[PDB]
Amino acid sequence: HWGYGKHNGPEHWHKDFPIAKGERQSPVDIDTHTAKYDPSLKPLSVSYDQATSLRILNNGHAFNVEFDDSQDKAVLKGGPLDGTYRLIQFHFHWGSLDGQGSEHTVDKKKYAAELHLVHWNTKYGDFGKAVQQPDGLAVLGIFLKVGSAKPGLQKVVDVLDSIKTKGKSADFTNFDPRGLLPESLDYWTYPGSLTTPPLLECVTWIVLKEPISVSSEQVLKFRKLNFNGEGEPEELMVDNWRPAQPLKNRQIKASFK
Ligand SMILES: NS(=O)(=O)c1ccc(-c2cccnc2)cc1
Ligand SMILES: NS(=O)(=O)c1ccc(-c2cccnc2)cc1
Ligand SMILES: [Zn+2]
């Protein structure tokens, strides 16, 4: 099916998912000079103290750390958002080389990877219903650069050997996603979409200005994962990012001067 190869990659997606050419597709380039400070934007409220991680899954496109989202345990509020958005999972997109991997770009700069913390609007009752709504999801995007290790990422890195191939999952309890955040919560925000099929136009994107630093060894271990299932020819899970899409009739807003 769809993927990131020459024959099933982002240039092909539109044939099965025509919304790929839509009016609010993600990711986008964040032109820092054109983004406008919006003094009416509230501080983000990230409340992850009660987060309950359950499982980590290689889904053949990335790996998801999944959370119990059957209660308001880990929620995102404030910023551009109206209401309460529940953390369901996080995952990353990354490159084959340190010079690429992020989906969003900043003045055309690509980072080595990008973390997506995916939340759904509780007024829609569940994730499946939320993705059908224009304000159904809030995805918190965080850039990764290669430098010093991120200690809070290590527990994720160390379990990856147990989920090498598509369809593999492993218990992953008591992981605290607060260890993946940068110090500052300054952000850019714009209306967009899922960055993989089904490419639904249901996301309020909140992209943090401050990247986190991860070590070369940490990202190298991401690159040992496989797109393929067990017993299939090895294809390394690398370059699982969609490139920047046209901004069209959208304005990117900044929370900071
Ligand atoms: N991105 S997409 O969803 O439109 C798509 C789906 C499938 C295939 C494909 C490739 C080779 C053999 N069989 C099928 C190519 C593209
Ligand atoms: N990269 S992203 O954060 O925009 C993202 C999040 C979720 C999904 C998704 C949702 C429903 C079904 N299948 C996949 C696709 C992409
Ligand atoms: Zn993503």
CB atoms within 10 A of CB 223: 16
Alpha helix positions (H), 96-238 = 127-130, 154-159, 216-222
What's the reported resolution, in angstroms, to a tenth? 1.4
Domain total of the chain: 1
φ, ψ of residue 163 in degrees (nearest 5):
-130, 45
- Sole residue written with tokens 């500052």: 184
* Dist. CA 32–CA 51, nearest whole Å: 33
What is the SS3 assignment for 68? coil
- The ligand placed nearest to the CA atom of residue 192 is 2
First to last CA, the chain: 43
Residue 103 structure tokens? 């989906």
Contact present, 100 and 243 (Cβ < 8 Å): no
- What the block records as the tokens of 112 is 């080595």
Query: What atom in ligand 2 is closest to the CA of residue 26?
Result: 4
Q: List the helix and strand counts (H, then E) for the chain.
A: 3, 15
The CATH number that applies at residue 191 is 3.10.200.10
- What is the Cα 232 distance to its own chain's centre? 27
**What contacts 24+ positions apart, CB below 8 Å, involve 15-23?**
16/197, 17/197, 17/198, 17/199, 19/193, 19/198, 19/199, 19/200, 19/201, 20/197, 20/199, 22/193, 22/199, 22/201, 23/201, 23/248, 23/249
Pocket of ligand 2 (CB under 6 A): 116, 118, 131, 139, 194-196
Method: X-ray
* Residues 15 and 183 sit within 8 Å (Cβ to Cβ): no
Phi, psi torsion values for 188, nearest 5 degrees: -105, 150
Positions annotated as catalytic residues are 61
* Ligand 1 pocket residue status of 2, Cβ below 6 Å: yes
- 239 to 37, 45, 99, 236, 251: CA distances (angstroms): 32, 31, 11, 9, 27
- What is the span of the domain harbouring residue 191? 1-257
For CA atoms 183, 117, 136, 103, give the dihedral sign: positive
What is the distance between the alpha carbons of residues 55 and 169, in angstroms, rounded to a whole number? 7
